[PDB]
């Protein structure tokens, strides 16, 4: 539903971001700076896919984003700058615990006096990532180091429409409040005692201030930034918000794509109305009701051939269901069912 009804993305083109960062940077043009040279090799390709996954992570608290890091043991200027961008631009409620911990450790390895990325990864356990992340965030929110961590809040607003189901509240896929000011879990100020050093890579203290300055979302798009959230809140049933995750690749994005998405301040955008989405949901419910009624009037028998039935009898039982799924008005459920048979088989669907 998110992929079908979100056909656009409201980002800003990268050239203006590069010019803004060049204006904010207090460095000579001849001198080479790695934070500047790392955003010149980035592109806003696939911002739409990242926007769809952001919306899914906002709606479902179990489908938190898992980041795929190209690095294994070593680091790189691109990795460091992208981790900083993710830290300062992507709220933590939309990221998984491991995704938070990896970027937190990358940030901490440069500000730590003796710790290194390889040691932090080897000593830490994937089981306790949330604790270690909390400790690192507390360390980075102390009075010696202060890095603002992006956050988000819940929203209740909705456009009026006729629907048979109750709705809930979701997080926002962007880091601002209703007023339009950026949201941070901790302080909004940046000050550091020393520089950033990890391996030979180094960043000046004013570079982070410039990066914070350039990562401010445009106030003008606020009206367009919330209509999509309104129509997404007002048209999705609330009882689906506790659903699990069945297809892993739907929640996986690589680091460069997420960094490019967060740098340009992209947000999902749509051109459809509220009633089309609720009509689609009503169609899905109608298909389920039709199949349930057919099963209740034909197949509902407890005396014989239940759990003990051999796998050979499944051909007869399934024929009626796949005949029902082939009539008009059931194409959405049929397509979703046939596309992902590997993850959700026919037997579990039949039992449900």
């Amino acid at each position: 539903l998110d992929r079908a009804f979100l056909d656009g993305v409201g980002f800003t083109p990268l050239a203006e971001k590069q010019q803004q960062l060049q204006l904010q940077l207090k460095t000579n043009i001849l001198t080479a700076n790695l934070i500047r040279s790392a955003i010149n090799g980035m592109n806003t390709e696939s911002n739409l896919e990242v926007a769809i996954k952001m919306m899914q992570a906002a709606q479902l608290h179990r489908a938190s984003i898992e980041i795929a890091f190209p690095m294994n043991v070593s680091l790189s200027p691109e990795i460091i700058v992208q981790c900083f961008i993710v830290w300062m631009s992507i709220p933590e409620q939309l990221l998984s615990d491991r995704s938070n911990f990896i970027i937190a450790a990358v940030i901490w390895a440069g500000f730590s006096a003796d710790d290194s990325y390889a040691d932090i990864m080897r000593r830490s356990a994937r089981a306790s990532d949330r604790q270690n992340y909390d400790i690192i965030k507390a360390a980075l929110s102390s009075r010696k180091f202060k890095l603002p961590r992006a956050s988000t809040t819940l929203f209740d607003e909705n456009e009026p429409v006729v629907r048979r189901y109750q709705i809930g509240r979701v997080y926002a896929p962007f880091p601002v409040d209703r007023y339009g000011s950026p949201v941070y879990s901790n302080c909004t100020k940046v000050e550091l005692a020393s520089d950033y050093n990890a391996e030979g890579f180094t960043i000046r203290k004013d570079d982070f201030r410039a990066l914070q300055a350039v990562l401010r979302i445009d106030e003008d798009r606020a009206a367009d930034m919330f209509t999509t959230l309104r129509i997404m809140i007002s048209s999705i049933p609330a009882v689906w918000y506790d659903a699990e995750v069945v297809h892993y690749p739907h929640t996986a994005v690589e680091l460069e794509q997420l960094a490019a998405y967060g740098l340009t301040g992209a947000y999902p955008r749509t051109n459809h109305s509220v009633d089309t989405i609720v009509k689609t949901v009503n169609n899905i419910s109608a298909t389920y009701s039709t199949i349930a009624q057919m099963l209740s009037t034909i197949d509902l028998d407890p005396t014989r051939y239940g759990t003990s039935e051999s796998i050979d009898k499944f051909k007869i039982a399934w024929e009626n269901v796949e005949s029902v799924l082939n009539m008009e008005g059931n194409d959405f459920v049929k397509t979703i069912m046939y596309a992902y048979e590997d993850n959700f088989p026919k037997k579990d669907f039949y039992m449900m």
Binding site: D301, P302, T303, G306, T307, S308, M351
Partner: protein
């Protein structure tokens, strides 16, 4: 035990008995095709012993049947006269007849006339009383409070109504027929059948503990005979024999099925063929 039976007990019993029979039939069906491999029979039953098509049951594992049995028993026999809307009850009048009783009447229940005139001792199937004082022919000696049907054997120094060796009324009364002085003794043996189903007594003992560990304030472990005597004593007066039979059938089937789902042996005929 303390327990209150509401006016809609037959309706609950007609669903509970059907659920018990379904579970027992599924147990035998799974017992017939056990692979006899590395997995035990308990795992096999826990994996494939559930019912999937009955309204009222919310799980496909045996635990669902257990929880449904608990709800039905609590609604039908315990203090809370709660009508279970979750199971579908459409007609409270339609009630399939239950199988006839099969329990032999060994310890027959009788009460003395209250004149303090006789002494009562029991035996395998007969009662026999000794006269404390002189008694004249043609007066009451004993009467049974637990209904009994069957034949009569070895009637000495007493009279009971009988046609061709068969008892006439379901509550026979023993009256002396001869003037009998000097602390004589009379006997009365019955080859009859009391209330309940004799088969599957091992499962009842293990299931009554299971359902008394839950309703410990109302149900206590005891023998089947005492349980059925009290259950029959608690029946309402405005109750026909067609309905009380269903109530008692469910009252005995629930502990038996609860204990059968633990010890995965067979099931009695009166439970299977309901």
């Amino acid at each position: 035990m303390n327990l209150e039976i509401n006016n809609f007990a037959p309706a609950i019993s007609s669903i509970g008995s059907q659920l018990c029979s379904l579970s027992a039939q599924k147990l035998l069906t799974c017992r017939k095709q056990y692979g006899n491999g590395a997995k035990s029979f308990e795992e096999f039953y826990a994996e494939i012993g559930g019912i999937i098509g009955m309204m009222g049951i919310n799980s496909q594992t045996p635990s669902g049947i257990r929880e449904a049995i608990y709800r039905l028993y609590q609604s039908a026999f315990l203090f809370g006269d709660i009508f279970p809307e979750s199971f579908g009850i459409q007609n409270t009048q339609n009630i399939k007849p239950p199988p006839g009783f099969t329990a032999p009447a060994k310890k027959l229940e009788v009460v003395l006339p209250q004149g303090g005139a006789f002494d009562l001792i029991y035996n395998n199937g007969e009662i026999r009383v000794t006269t404390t004082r002189n008694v004249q022919a043609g007066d009451l000696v004993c009467t049974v409070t637990f209904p009994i049907q069957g034949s009569v054997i070895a009637t000495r120094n007493c009279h009971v109504n009988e046609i061709g060796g068969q008892l006439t009324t379901t509550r026979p009364e023993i009256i002396a027929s001869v003037p009998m002085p000097a602390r004589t003794v009379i006997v009365a043996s019955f080859d009859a059948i009391e209330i309940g189903y004799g088969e599957g007594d091992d499962l009842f003992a293990i299931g009554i503990a299971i359902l008394s560990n839950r309703f410990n304030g109302q149900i206590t472990p005891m023998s089947r005979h005492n349980y059925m005597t009290q259950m029959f004593a608690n029946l309402p007066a405005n109750m026909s024999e067609r309905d009380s039979s269903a109530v008692l059938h469910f009252a005995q089937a629930a502990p038996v099925v609860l204990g059968m789902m633990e010890r995965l042996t067979g099931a009695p005929k009166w439970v299977l063929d309901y």
